[model samples]
Target: SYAKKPHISALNAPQLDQRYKNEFTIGAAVEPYQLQNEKDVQMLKRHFNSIVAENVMKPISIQPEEGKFNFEQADRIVKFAKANGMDIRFHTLVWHSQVPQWFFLDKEGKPMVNETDPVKREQNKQLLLKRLETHIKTIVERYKDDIKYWDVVTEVVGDDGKLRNSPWYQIAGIDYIKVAFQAARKYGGDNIKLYMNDYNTEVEPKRTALYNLVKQLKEEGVPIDGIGHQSHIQIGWPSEAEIEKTINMFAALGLDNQITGLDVSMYGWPPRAYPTYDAIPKQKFLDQAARYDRLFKLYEKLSDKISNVTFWGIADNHTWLDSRADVYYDANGNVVVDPNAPYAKVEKGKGKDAPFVFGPDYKVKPAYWAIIDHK
Candidate 1:
C-alpha cells in the first residue's frame, strides 16, 4: 500500500485538505521594507509560493527623485525569491498615487498644475509621457526575464465610475495608461504579462466602465494582458452576488483575472464604529468568514478563468485598518483628535475591530491559514 500523506489540520480541513495535496498557486502581497528582516522572509517563504513587491517596484519607491533608479531594495527581493524558488510579480509601473513630484513639474522648477490651459497642458502631457516611457522601459528592462507578471497600470479608475482624473490625465490626457502598457511591451516583449489593476472594479457603473475600457484597449492593441481587481472588502459590503458578478465580468474579457489586495475589515468597533471608524463585532467576523467562503467557492467555480489571488498584507498589524475619517493622534504629539469624538463616544461604540490575522503571538493570524486553505 502507498504511504499516507500528512494528516489534514486546521479549520475546514476536509475542503482544504484536497487543495493542499495539489500544487496550487498561493501568493502574498508584501512590501520590500517589511522584508528588511531575515526572519520575515523565511516566514513568508514557508507559506506563500509567489511574492508581489507591494511598493518598492512602484514609481516613487523605485525612482523617488527623477532619473535616479534604486534597485538595491528590489534586487535583494528578487534574489531572495530566486534562491528560494519563488515566483515574482512586479507591481505597478504607473500609478497616480506614490508618484514623485518632479515628474509633474517643469525644468523651470514650476509645478505644472495648470492642465486646464490646452497649450500648457499639451506641453506638460508630452513631458509626462516621456517620463512614463523612460520609467517603464528602464524598470522592466532591468527585470526583463526575471518577473513573470507585471501590473503595468494601477488604480486608473475613479470612484465616480470613470477613469481617474489625475495630473497625468489632465496633462497626458486619458491615453497615459495605454502608453504605459505599450512601453512595457516594447521593452519586455511577449514574455511578460501586463495587467490593469484597480479597487472597486467589482461595483456597478465602474465595473462596466472598466470592462468596456479594457475591451477597447485590447481592440486597439494596447498589449494589455490581465485585469487585477483589488478586493479590499469589509463586512456588509459587496454582497455575494456582487462578488460573483464582478468575477464573471472580468473573466468575460478573455484576459487573466486576479484578486489583488484582498482584505475584509470589520466595522462595529469603538472609534472605528459609526461617525468614526465604523467597525462591527464578532458577527462581522462570522459574515467575513462566510463571505470569504462564498468568494473562494466562486473562485473555485471559475478557477479556469482566473489566474492569481494576492492579499494586500499578511497580518493586521501592518494593515491600514484605522478609521479614515477619524484623527485620534498625530506624529508631533498633537491632540488633533476627531471633532466628532465626543458625540461618537456618547454612542459608546466598541474598540477597533481586528480585520486581518493576529496569531497567538498576536502576529500572522488565522487569515493566513484561511488563504492557504482556500488554494
Candidate 2:
C-alpha cells in the first residue's frame, strides 16, 4: 500500500529563513524539476533564502565532453534563484564522483593518473593539471556575478583522514587542490568565497587529518575562505558536544564553517535499510524531532562561526537517503540482511526514508516544529 501522505500546507507555517536572518543564510540543494511544481516553488521561496544546484551544476552535467560546455540546465536554476531574490551558492567546482571518465583518460585511451611508466606519468600529470585549470576557469567565470560562495572542492578527504585516491589527487600529488583553488580565485575574483567541503568531519582520525590538510594548505597560501561540513548525520550518532567541538576547532583557523548538506537520516550509522515507514516504531519520528531541536539550539549559539546552513533536499519525498541499501539493522547497529528485501532495489515513492522537515505531503513534520519552537 502507498503511504498515505499528510494533507496540509506549509503556507501558514512560520518563515524559517526569517527566524535566523541575523545569523546565517538558510538554503536548500534542489533539482531543477522540483522548481517546476507550483507547490514546491512556493514552499522553497517562502522558507529558503539561498539555493544550490543538486546535480545540473556538476562537472559531468556542465561540461561532459571536455571542451564542450552545457550551461542550459544550470542557467535555468540561476535564473529562478535570481528572479526570486534568493542567493546562489554554486556547488562543487571539482569532485571525484559524477565527473566524466574522460577526465582520467589520456589521449591514447589509457588511464592518465595511473600510467605505470614514470616518464609518461609525469607527462600525463601536466596534461591533467592543465585540463583542470581550463575547466575551473570556464565554469567559475560564467557564474561569477550570480554566485558568491563556491564549494571549490568536495570529498577530497576520505573517512580515514587521508586524501582520497581520486584522479585529481593521483595525478598531481596534492598540487591538484592547490591548482584548483588558485584557478578559482583567479577567475572567481576577490568577491567570491571558495570552500573545501567534505563529510564525516565530526569523527576522530578523519577529522584530525582534514584539520592538518587545511592547515598546511592555508600555510602555503591557498585562498580557501571557508569549510563546508557536509553534516549528513543520523538521528542518534554524533553528540551535540562533538558538533560544538568541530565548529570550535575549525574556528581557531579563522575560517567560516558552513553546515553544507545537512540532513538527519532517520537511521543510525553504518547504513543498512528499512523498506517501509510502517515497520519503524512511532517513537523514531519523535526521536528525529528532538535531535533537530538540540542541533538548532547549538547552531544558534554558534551563529558567529556559521555562515550558511543548507539542507540536502526540500522534503522527505525526495532525498538521497532513499537510495541506500535495503537491509535491516540489528541491536549492535550492524546490517542484518533481510531475506525478503526487494532485489530490484528499494521501491521508489515508498516513503520509507524521510529525513527532512516536511513529509511527502508538504506538511510540516514534528522536526519542523522542533526548529520553529526551539529555545
Candidate 3:
C-alpha cells in the first residue's frame, strides 16, 4: 500500500512537525486568548513545531499607540513559542488594514492629506519612507534572532493586479513593497525568510495576475523568499487537481509555496453539511482528512518548493471566523454556545461550527486521524 508517509498517519502518534523533518514545517496560528487554555497550550507544543501570532503582531495590536512598543501580549506568545521550541513566522510588517488611526496623520496630529502637487508628493513619499524604514528596522532587529519567517507584505494587490490604494502607495508608489523587503533584509538580514502573502490566488484570472506579479518581482530581483496561498477554502472550492496544478505552477517559479492558511471557513457545502449537532458526521471528517492527506501529498511531491503549511488556528474553539462571529444557544438548552450561531452564513451553513479538526471538547476528531492515517 502506498500509505507510505509517516505523516499520513502520525495522528495520535507523534506531531506532524517531527514527522515531516526537513520536508516542511507544520504550523498553527495562536492568539493571545488561546494562551489562557492549558489544553490548547499542551496540544500546540505537542503537535506543531511552527507558531504564528494570529493577531498580536499585527499593526493595530502590536504598536497600538505607536513608538511605545507594547510587547506585553506579543511577548507572552513569543515566550510560549520559544519555550515550546517552535519556529516563528512573524506576520505582516506592512499592511493597510487594522492600522492605528495615527498612521495617516500630519505633524500637528491631523489626518495627512494626499498631496496633489508633484513636489509635495515627493516630500510625502520621503516622509513615508523614513517612517517605514524606522518601523521595520526597529521591530525586525529587536526580534532578529527569534523571528525566522515574515509575511513582510500582504494583500498589497487588488483585482487589477495593482497595489492596493493606501497611504503607502499614495506616498511611495508601488515600490513601497520593494522598500519593505529591502528594509526587512537590512535588519533581519538573509537569515529571515520574507514572504509576500495573499489570499484567493486559487480563484479566477486573479491566479494568472498573481503569477505575473510574482514573476515580475522575481525577475527584477526582489528578495522574496516565497508565496502564500491563504487557502481559506470551502469544500470542493477548487478541485484537488486544480489546487495541485496551481501549486506546481507556483513551485516551478523556484520559491517556497506555502499554503499559509487552511481551515473550514465554511462548515460545509452540499454533500458535507452537518445533519445534527455532532460537530460533523464521521464520514465528513474522514473526507476532510483525505483532503489534508491530498494537500500533504502535494507538499511531499514538491518538497523542494513548498516548505510549510500553517493552519489558521489550532482548534475548533479558536478560529478567525469565530472571532468575528457570534456564539449562540437555544432557549431550551440554556448553556452558553449551545446552538452555535443560528445564522445561515455562520460558516456558509447553519448553526455554530466545530469547523476545525478538534471538536469543542478538545478531543481529536476523525479528521485529525485522517491526516495521520494511511496516505
Candidate 4:
C-alpha cells in the first residue's frame, strides 16, 4: 500500500526545473552562511517548495553576542523562503554544540556555576529558559504563519549512548529541553510542529533512550509533535533490524517521524575506516547500494508514519563525507588525483570519516542512481 505513492521528493535547482516538472512538493536544505549572494537564494528557490535554514536559525548564529540578537542573515533566508511560495523549517532552536559563549557565563562573566550543584544549576536554568523564550518569541512571532516546522532541539546524544551534556543541560538542567519546546509553542501557531532531532539514534541504547524520552514527553503533555532521525548512516552501522525497530518504535508513539539527514557512506565496512585509503572499489559501491536499498525499503514501509525525508547533500561532489572520511593520497602526501585508486591507499579518517560523494566532474555517481531508483 505504501509503495503506491512517493511521499516526498527533495531536489536542487537543475534537477527541479529539468527533471521534476510534475506537481510534487520539493524541499531544499541550505546553510544561511552559504547564501551570501542573491543568486544562491534564487537558485535555491527554483527547486524547493520548502526551505530549511540549515545553521543560521540555530541558537549560536542568531544570538552570538550576550543580550544581542542578530537577524540579518536569518531574516534574509526566511524572506526568501516566503517570497518564493516555500514553507520554512527553522533548523534548530536549542542544541548543545554551537552555543554562544555568553550562555555559559554568569552575570560576573565567570564560568556559570557547576552543573553538578543543584541550586546554582537551577539559576542557570532559569537564565537559559528566559533566553530561549525570548528567542522563540521574537523569531516565531515575526513569521508565525509562514514557518510550519521547527527542530526545537537537536543532536543531544553523544557517541557513547548518553544524552549530550551541553551547557544548556548543565546550566538549565535536563528540563531545558522541555522549556525550549514550550517557548517555541508559545510563539508558534497551531500549524507548527516542534521536533527533537539527533544522529545515530537509530541504534540500540540511543534508540531506547530516545523512545523513553519521547514517551515521557508525550505523557507529560509536552508539545513535541515529531522526532528527527539524522540518518547519517554508513554501509553497515544500522542493520535492517535496527532500522526497522527504531522506525516502528517511533511510529508506535503516534507522532510524526522524519529522516532528517539521510546520507549513505560506502567508504568501508562497519567499525572500519571510510573512504578506503585506496581507490573506491566496485564491490564497495555495490555494498553501499545494497545498504541504501534496505533503508529505502524500510522507508517505503514507514512512509505513512514518516512525513519527510531529507538528504544532507544533493551530490557526492558536495557531500560532507569527503571531509569526514579518509581518501587516497599520493606518495608525496597530497590527495591522489586519480579517481580510481585502490582501497589500500585510502586512509580512513581517524574516527567516523568517509569520502566525498561525487567524481571530479561533479556529476552523480552510481550511488545517485541507486537513490533515484530506490525512491
Candidate 5:
C-alpha cells in the first residue's frame, strides 16, 4: 500500500508510513468534523500512519463550559484511529488559549481581572488550580492508554526569550509549567510522553530560551520527556540552517524532537476569502513541492534526532491556512477589504498558509510525493 490505493480516484500518492517505516511517524492533525467525511477518512487511513486532533482536544472545543466534558467528538476520533490501527497523539492537555472562562472565576463566580490584587492572587490561584487539576485528571484517566503524546504546554514563551503573560503563567507563575508536566505524569504515568510545545522556536533568543527551559527542567528532575517545535513556518522566514540548528539544540538537550506543525504557511489559501485549489497554477505547485523536498531531505539526514514528523494536514481543503478568519467577498470573486471582518489584523500576509500535501480537489501534488521520495 505504499503506492496509491486504486479506489481513491481523487488521490494518487505514496503511503508516507511505508516510505519512512523506520525513520519516524508521519501524521496529520485532523479536526473532529473531518472525521465525519467518509472520503477524507479513507484518505487519512491511506496516507498516514498516525493521527491527531487539531482542535477537538483543545479546551475551547472539548470543554466549552465549566465542568462539562464533551468526549463525543474526541471519542469519535479515538475510535476511528484505533479502528484503523493508527497511532494517536493527544494534541494538548493544557494551554493558555481556549481556556474556559470559569477557570478564572471566584466564589461569586465573577471573572477575576488579571491585576485584581497581589494579596487576592493567592486565593484566585488556588481556585484556578483546582479547576486545572480536575480538568486534567478527568481527561487523562479516561484516555491514558489511547494517547501517547501529550502537549503539556503550548506557546508560553514569546519571541523575546521570556514567558508570555498568560493566565496560567500570571496566576501560577513558571511553576505552572512544572505543575502541568507533573499532573500529566501522575495521570498518564510512564506509558505516556509529555512535551513542551511552542511555535517560532527556529530563531534565537527563542531557541536559546527553549533550551534554557528544558535544561532547567532536566536539572530539576521535572517529569518532562520531549519538545514539540510547532514548525508553523513560512518558506523564506527561517533558513534551513536555522531550522536544523533549533532541532539540534533541542536534541542536544537529550529531548525527543517532535516537529509538531511543519509547512510553509505562506502558500496557504485565503480561509475567509476565495482562490480555491482550482485557481492555483501548476507551476507554483511545482515550486512549492521543491520547497517540500528541500525540507524533507534535511529531515531525512537527521532522522536519528527526530521522533515524529506531522504535516498540519493531509489535503488543502482543510489546511490550517487562514483557518478561521472571517470576511466577505465581492460578486466577481474579489476580496473586498472589510474593516468589519474579525482578525483582519491577525491574518498573516493578508491570508492563510496553504500547507497541505494534496490540492483542494484531494488529488496528490508534488509536495505529497516529495516527502515520500524514499530511496
Candidate 6:
C-alpha cells in the first residue's frame, strides 16, 4: 500500500499567528477560489491573521478602464477577510505592471513615453499624474476604513538603484512616485500605513540604490511609513548575513518593516520547472527548512522592527511561482514546458514549483515545522 501523510488540518500544530503573536502578524496571500473552498478558508482562519488579495486588488482588476470600476471581486476578498476578523493588507496603489494601457497613451493613442516634444511630454506628465491621483483617491476612499496597510509604490526602484524606466517614469520622472505617495496620504485615513514593496532587496547596487531612494524620500518629508521586503529567496542562496544587513540597514531609518512576499523556492536565478514532485531532491526541502528556521530566528531577534511577515501564498499548490508559464502535464502527471517553448507559449496551467510551508496535498511541510520549531 502506498503511504500518505495526514492532511494539514489533522495536525495539532499551534496557530502560526499565535506563535509570533508578540513578534508580528502571520499573513498569507489568498485567491478568490481559495476563499470559496471551505477547507482552504478553514486553513486560512486557523493560521493567518492577515490576508492580501493575490490579484483581485490590483489596478487592472479594480479599474480596467479609465473611469469604469469593478469592485465585485475585490469586495468579496475584503468581505471574507472582514467576516473572518482578518486584517487586510491593501496591495499596490501604484505600480508599473498590471496597469491598463490607456493610462500611458496620449490623445492620438500614441505611447506617452514616446512623446519627445517638451510640450507634449509635459502634457503627458501632467495628465498621467492626474489620472494616478484620481485612481488612488477613488480606491483608498472606498476601503480607507477597512484596510490599514497599503503598498503605495511597488517595485519602483531598479536593480541599478535608479527608478525603473517605466512608462510612469518616462513621462513624469520622479514626480509620479511623489504624486502617488502624496495622493495615498491625502485620501487615505490617518491610520493608514503606507509601504514601498519590492523583491531582491538584499542584493548590492540595488540595495544601496534603494537605501538612497528611501533616504531621499524621507528627507523630503514623504508620507512613506514602511518598507515591504518581498523576501523571495531560494533554498541555498541569500546568505543569512545579507538578510540581516538589509533588515538592520532599513531599521536604522526608524521605519516599520514587513516581509511582504515571503517564499522559499527550490530553484534560483535561472529558474526551470521540475518535471515532477519526485524530480526535486529531498535535500532541497531540508535546505528550505533550514533557510526558514534561520530567517525566522533572525526576525524574532529583531522582532521589534518587523511588524508583519506574509507568505506569498497559503500553500504550494496555489503559489504564483508555478503558474508563471504555460505548462502541461504528461501522462504520468509530470509538468512539462509546452513543446513550443520560445516562439509561441501559452500562459496557462501549472508548472511544478514547490515553494511554501504546506504541500499540495495540504500537509504541513518541513518548513512549517522549522518556523514553529521553538518551544
List the RMSD of every prediction in angstroms.
Answer: 6.5, 4.5, 5.3, 6.1, 4.7, 4.3
Per-residue lDDT for 108-183 in model 5, tens only?
8776555467777888777777777778888899999998888888887878899877778777778777777888
Q: How close is candidate 6 to the true structure, as a TM-score?
A: 0.90
Please give the lDDT score at residue 223 for candidate 4.
Answer: 90
Tens digits of per-residue lDDT, candidate 6, 1-375, equal: 001332354135668888998999999998888888976887888888999988888898888999988888888888988998888898888888898988999989999978879998999899999999999999999999999899998999998778899998888999888889889989986799999888888998888888888889889988888999998888767888898899899889888899999988776554545655656676777778778888899999989999999999987767888755235455555554434334323235334678887887777777777887682
Output the TM-score of candidate 1. 0.81
Cα lDDT of candidate 1 equals 0.68
**Alpha-carbon runs more than 4 Å astray in model 1:** 1-24, 36-39, 115-117, 268-284, 323-353, 357-375
List, residue by residue over 319-348, the lDDT tens digit for candidate 4: 555555555556665554344653345565
| Residue 42, model 4: Cα distance from true site in angstroms | 8.5
Local error of candidate 6 at residue 6 (angstroms)? 8.2
Q: Ten consecutive residues with minimal summed lDDT in candidate 5?
A: 1-10
TM-score of each: 0.81, 0.91, 0.83, 0.78, 0.87, 0.90
Ranking by lDDT: 2, 6, 5, 3, 1, 4
Report the Cα lDDT for residue 188, model 2. 82
Q: List the residue pairs that clash in candidate 3.
A: 8-372, 9-372, 9-373
Number of colliding residue pairs in model 3: 3
- Between candidates 3 and 4, the TM-score winner: 3
| Candidate with maximal TM-score | 2
* Each prediction's whole-model lDDT (CA): 0.68, 0.83, 0.71, 0.66, 0.74, 0.82
Residue ranges of candidate 2 with Cα displaced over 4 Å: 1-8, 328-351
Candidate 2 C-alpha lDDT tens digits along 182-233: 9999998999998999888899888888888889999999998888999999
lDDT of 6 at 88: 87
Q: TM-score of the candidate numbered 4?
A: 0.78
